[PDB]
Symmetry: D2
Subunit: 343 residues, 4 copies
């Protein structure tokens, strides 16, 4: 059994909110969903990330969750380099390694769960209890790969929960957002000053369309979960799949952590096709419903071979972003394409 | 057990469609959801209704489902009067009355299910075989009060399935539509000619935003059903409620028909408060989450006393349009307000 | 000297307006611009036309301005045929012919000025004094080819001024409208009843975006006029142009009427290239700035050979819709392409 | 005589442009209008300003045009303080003071023309040769108070031309932008890196709606100029006005520079009412067409008493943002209100 879904969530998304009034209402809304007293809207998740780092001073160290196969490590390096900050990347799925890597100059720790695309799950409050045991170190959790609907990092010990809205989310509505939620009273003040004085803020239209999208997040994510679960279960029992990686499955090496840390899972399913690279690539060309794309989220089910679209990652590793179509149609498409790769 | 949900529905809404290209894609999409070969988009449900009547000639008779407590009878009278047509209103929930009322001048039969607000359920395929047993008579079903997701009138024997989109629907997006689906190819041709020659058509923006809304109709209506079900069940077992009218409940006099005719029910719940008019009106002003409105649909739960907001209808009859908030929050609001009316 | 521009026009468009509140504000706004007490918004110009005809009774006759090379004659025939109306087409640029064609059954007269694409100008109040001398006959002027900014048919004697907004107007904003303005107190009432009872009405979004576009109509049309004038003048003095048709030029056979009937002209310029069909078609392929299109209006300058894109019309007749680009750039493109057709 | 309007401007805005395709097209378009090889879009003018400062290193000095009565000096102080930069404010309308204030640590010079609200005009090319005479110093001109249509700072010697789009601009369309144009290719490269690595960028929706607004900028600004000119001339010859400040008037102390530096002026007119503060405030409440607001731009004419709405500024100084209404209507409103303040 997972964590029970957060109370008043859907009610809050729909009713909460109903200077910059549109942004103010959005921040008021999101803060509720994040189980927070405060929230700040920025022009993008990246801009949100930069602002958070501006809380630090030259010489201070950041420790980041090591994103091996994603590209995000670069972006953090460029920011740290730009503002004279020390940075280090650690596999925080191994809680020892994090604790071992902390210095007295460590002031910020950044965490993504689950990781993309191999989906390792990081114990948030495990990390939080390690981070807060000595010194004052801000713990930030990138809450993008789950939603506020499935994961609440603030109620888990993190000091900051950042959610990045991309142009692909909510049926490809071209909304881009960096949403920073915090329960600390000093943190909100400093961030708020940074927000208004640096101007990295969304437009009123962005704020409106983002707020609008939130109102259907729960029913959307549920279907993502429902379909994802189905797709994962099907793939795992399929004779042409080596193995499957999906946090909602008991087969997942961190499944027990997931159930106590989250209320559900997204439509992001990773699996390993049997055979070599060229079965994986035949498979991809036989999909008639799944669309080939590197993006994440959306109403349409997406498929990706990260080994070719971006030591190297597995050529048999495939990452699906399961959409909102009929479960059967998805299963049938996968079944057909898998069969096409193994005559 | 209800009818199994229509296959490929969610897939179709999301993928089908992806002169007037935007309208063409919308009509192509909706036709799939309506289980139809053809669909036509008009500027409004009313304009769609007028167009359908233009299939007839002066002297031809229409027989309409008698909408007692709704206002719609007027609109049909005005149309019939305008174009020299005879019209008569019959309680078609009693199939007896319909067959008795058929004339050789009868050319069109109009049907709404369920009715508003007392929610009578009309046997569509019962009516369809009665209508098609002699003469050439078009049967039209107003499929607005259910969705194409819950009810498919074309697969039930009707010749025409009209869906009227209002601006309150899909989170109050200001989209207005008349959508006419038909499986007959002579019918489609005449309607298509009428459509392009009379100009009562939506704008490209309307078509786009309508098409966009369709892609989440299934997950939205499901939540409406889930919450509606919860609300209905709660009310019925509540000591301050005389009785409850909800097609999804076994207590409903047409429940068996519903399960055979539909795949589910909407968030429209009608019940009778105990006591007189003034408990009903105390109840309404103690609601803190439900919003007082005469409109139907939306993300927000609505409450209405039709006896005051429009032989007279019951002073104790209340009609709720249950939204997408958290089931618990709704139940508590209703529970609180009911007790507030009965010290 | 033309008629002085209508007073308070720009002020009205911007400030006037700042049931169906958005439509109500739009109708209030447009009525001011049309110099009217009343205005009604329909889903399209065609729907507006149909509604106007519904003022008539079976057997009543319509007399329409004969649109030879446009297609619109068909649409009127289909409507008249649909509702048992008698119809006749007369060259109303010859005022005698109109007066000669009036019957006691004549109840409606329809007029477009200027015509498309040969741009004959009809004397509105000449027609109005002929129409109103006996019987009660509604005179309607299709005020689409001019704007309310350049032409005010109600202040000229017409009983009804209809303006049709197409998806191409106001920088291709997908707004479609039928706007009917009237000063008569019986006419407005009947039309208003027809409007609300037949449902051929625009959406709130349509109404908003239409209202928004109006606020810049004056500065837009001015540039259309300014550029059009330049283009016309250039073409007429160009050695590869047989002759030019533009109401703003003294060379135009109805120029004197135009100046007393209008406050300016649009960007619609018609001219005859020297030589045969194949110089005209070479010319078209050498345009690098002008875009080949059959549509009318928009920010981009458009070119059309109606003889090929739709007794026959001239193969050397070309109709330009001059946009809002720099006058020189337009002139240079035309000069270059003309020179390319005559080595 | 002013500078001749920039060639191909209107053509470019309309046609140029027709990764992040929407932003790329916008930047491609704006660069043309700015007479630039390159342009970069940021989430806001303020974010654009911060990015530009990030070209500098701790210890480097900025010299800013001293914005006395505006608030902008604060924002620069906060930025400089945040990133360890020295800053100084100099009246650069007096070229004397600027040259005297240049240090070897001086790396950036910031300039606004005209100033708000007293409208000092700064000699851009005067400042540019002073700045570029020794050392490597970036000159930036805030080109917001004029448009790219009236002022081209890059063609005048500046290295960077920044245009800040506010949500009041283009008929209050909620678009917010920072647009940075540069002709240096080293400058563009560093800025481009900063742009993509810091994430302070607009959304696709922002870029689209901004790009859309550009297409009518020329015809809009012209009307602003035309009306502004009229308003200024009227006020100056009005017996209840002490004096008037408008760059388009020969009475303006920098008028000759203006004509050499610009192709026209905006709708921003500053004047001094006769009498004391209380005539100025009576005047404001008697305006029936002008709207009281502190914002700048829009379709509607605005009035502001900066002495009360924000050594102190004049109690009799009033700043108007003249809109797009009819010149006469504006003149009558001003005439009426002025007489209302002087019985």
């Amino acid at each position: 059994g997972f964590l029970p879904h957060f109370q008043h969530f859907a009610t809050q998304a729909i009713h909460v909110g109903q200077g910059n009034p549109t942004r103010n209402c959005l921040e008021k809304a999101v803060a509720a969903l994040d189980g927070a007293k405060y929230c700040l809207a920025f022009a993008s998740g990246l801009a949100a990330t930069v602002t958070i780092t501006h809380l630090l001073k030259a010489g201070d160290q950041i420790i980041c969750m090591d994103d091996v196969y994603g590209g995000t490590n670069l972006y953090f390096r460029q920011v740290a380099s730009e503002f004279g900050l020390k940075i280090s990347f650690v596999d925080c799925s191994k809680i020892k390694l994090l604790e071992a890597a902390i210095t007295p100059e460590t002031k910020l720790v950044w965490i993504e769960t689950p990781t993309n695309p191999t989906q390792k799950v990081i114990d948030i409050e495990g990390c939080a209890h390690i981070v807060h045991k000595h010194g004052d170190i801000i713990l930030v959790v990138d809450n993008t790969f789950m939603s506020p609907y499935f994961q609440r990092p603030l109620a888990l010990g993190a000091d900051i929960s950042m959610y990045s809205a991309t142009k692909y989310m909510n049926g490809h509505s071209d909304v881009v957002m960096g949403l920073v939620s915090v329960n600390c009273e000093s943190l909100h003040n400093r961030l708020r000053f940074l927000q208004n004085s640096l101007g990295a803020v969304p437009s009123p239209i962005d704020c409106y369309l983002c707020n609008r999208g939130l109102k259907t997040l729960h029913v959307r994510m549920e279907k993502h979960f429902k379909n994802g679960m189905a797709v994962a279960q099907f793939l795992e029992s399929n004779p042409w799949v080596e193995k499957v990686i999906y946090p909602g499955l008991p087969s997942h090496p961190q499944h027990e952590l997931v159930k106590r840390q989250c209320t559900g899972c997204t439509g992001m399913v990773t699996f390993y096709i049997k055979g070599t690279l060229q079965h994986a690539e035949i498979f991809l060309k036989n999909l008639k419903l799944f669309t080939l794309a590197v993006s994440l989220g959306g109403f349409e089910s997406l498929a990706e071979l990260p080994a070719i679209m971006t030591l190297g990652i597995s050529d048999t590793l495939i990452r699906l972003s399961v959409g909102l179509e009929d479960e059967e149609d998805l299963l049938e498409d996968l079944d057909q394409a898998l069969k096409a790769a193994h005559p």
